[PDB]
Amino acid sequence: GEAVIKVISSACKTYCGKTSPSKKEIGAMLSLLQKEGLLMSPSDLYSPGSWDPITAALSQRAMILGKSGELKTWGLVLGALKAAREE
């Protein structure tokens, strides 16, 4: 699943950022997930709707992130997940 990674990375930005070069792409992708209880690798993608875990993650400690303000980075990461649901 070359996406499991590309997704986490791209998704992060490509998801709710698809445009920029990578202001927080790989960042949140790793820092976000790797900082939201997703230190199990980009395998998260290996599971459908595994962006719900990163949601309650930052929520559990939205004050643990701060690469663009606080949760702004997540927003792009998570906000994207919600974007998928919105289509």
Curated annotation (Swiss-Prot):
Descriptive protein name: Matrix protein p19
Subcellular localization, as worded in the UniProt entry: Virion
Organism: Rous sarcoma virus subgroup C (strain Prague)
